Nucleic acid binder design. Structure first.
Ligand SMILES: Cc1cn([C@H]2C[C@H](O)[C@@H](COP(=O)(O)OP(=O)(O)OP(=O)(O)O)O2)c(=O)[nH]c1=O
Ligand SMILES: [Mn+2]
Ligand SMILES: [Mn+2]
Ligand code: NA
Ligand code: NA
Length: 327
DNA sequence: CATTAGA
DNA sequence: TCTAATG
């Protein structure tokens, strides 16, 4: 956690580099398990050899550990850190839409800078277009203060359309969080559960509504159950316009809300920790359900959930407020 | 790990 | 279809 720190960190640095700049999924996969194990290791690793004893620890990596333990650096990390080509890949990547794959390609063609990205907006697909467009706005944290106004509106229209809808803004915002990256809204309706062969419109109507009023400004991706866009709070009575925010709403079979909800609420750890528990408690939890465990090794049979509570009860735990789902 | 664009 | 990008 801090004793193995640099090691895991140069290691991660290393891995990440192969996967993006290089198309070396393996080496990349190498660095990670290694980075994974030394990480767990209970003592200050003192030399390659020592490290080497570890599963996933090759001669390759071990050697890197030495140079790093010896000199508080690494040539390969320095060389990369410098590499203009590799720098560029790292960056274009920021654009919502641009992945490594396209990052290389662009680079090759010569789009290194943001401005390049501009002159060639043509080479970019709609996602990346918008990506490039709200580049600033996108990189900005979301004050809860705004999250409150946002949630407010979504909630309202959702309701105006059909009072029957249920909505939850999940994520950290739900979890107290002073700020948020983007807004996650989970949606479901009663007329839409496990079987009941869809009702695409279900999503659709709402999207239409939010746009109707100008909350949604653009569509990144809209499918029958997952809409992904851009929004913005009404820039008041001028002088102060609001930044464009990433928003995502998804339809959910009413019969799998709370789990899904439980789930997306986090935290990453509270979840795992929660999950790890239901296990002992004779269960199984996952993004949509909670099945009672059987001794033959495994088992099925989706237990009925009416609220975050039920889930808790099941595994017989103490209801934890979002606020304290911290871990 | 499953859902969308796109080619 | 597969392959990328998001989450
Ligand atoms: C998992 C963590 C969340 O439950 C969900 C994905 O949510 P994310 O939006 O990826 O993350 P977050 O809401 O925890 O972070 P923030 O709002 O600060 O950006 O799946
Ligand atoms: Mn979020
Ligand atoms: Mn998110
Ligand atoms: Na070994
Ligand atoms: Na990106």
């Amino acid at each position: 956690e801090t004793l193995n720190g640099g090691i895991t960190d140069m290691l991660t640095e290393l891995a990440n580099f192969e996967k993006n700049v290089s198309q070396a999924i393996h080496k990349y996969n190498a660095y990670r398990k290694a980075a994974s194990v030394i990480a767990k290791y209970p003592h200050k690793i003192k030399s390659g050899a020592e490290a080497k004893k570890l599963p996933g620890v090759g001669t390759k990596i071990a050697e890197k550990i030495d140079e790093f333990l010896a000199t508080g650096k690494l040539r390969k990390l320095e060389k990369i850190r410098q590499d203009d080509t590799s720098s560029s890949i790292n960056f274009l990547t920021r654009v919502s839409g641009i992945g490594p794959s396209a990052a290389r390609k662009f680079v090759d063609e010569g789009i290194k800078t943001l401005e390049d990205l501009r002159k060639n907006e043509d080479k970019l697909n709609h996602h990346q277009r918008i990506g490039l467009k709200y580049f600033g706005d996108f990189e900005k944290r979301i004050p809860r203060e705004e999250m409150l106004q946002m949630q407010d509106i979504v909630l309202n229209e959702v309701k105006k359309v059909d009072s029957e809808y249920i909505a939850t803004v999940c994520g950290s915002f739900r979890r107290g969080a002073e700020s948020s990256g983007d807004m996650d809204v989970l949606l479901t309706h009663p007329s839409f559960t496990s079987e009941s062969t869809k009702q695409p419109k279900l999503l659709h109507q709402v999207v239409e509504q939010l746009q109707k009023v100008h909350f949604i400004t653009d569509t990144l991706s809209k499918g029958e159950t997952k809409f992904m866009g851009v929004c913005q709070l009404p820039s008041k009575n001028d002088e102060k316009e609001y930044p464009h925010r990433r928003i995502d709403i998804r339809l959910i079979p009413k019969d799998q809300y709370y789990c899904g909800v439980l789930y997306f609420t986090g935290s990453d750890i509270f979840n795992k920790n929660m999950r790890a528990h239901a296990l002992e408690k004779g269960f199984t939890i996952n993004e949509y359900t909670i099945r009672p465990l059987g001794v033959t090794g495994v088992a099925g049979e989706p237990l009925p959930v009416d609220s975050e509570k039920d889930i808790f009860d099941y595994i017989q735990w103490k209801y934890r407020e979002p606020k304290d789902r911290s871990e």
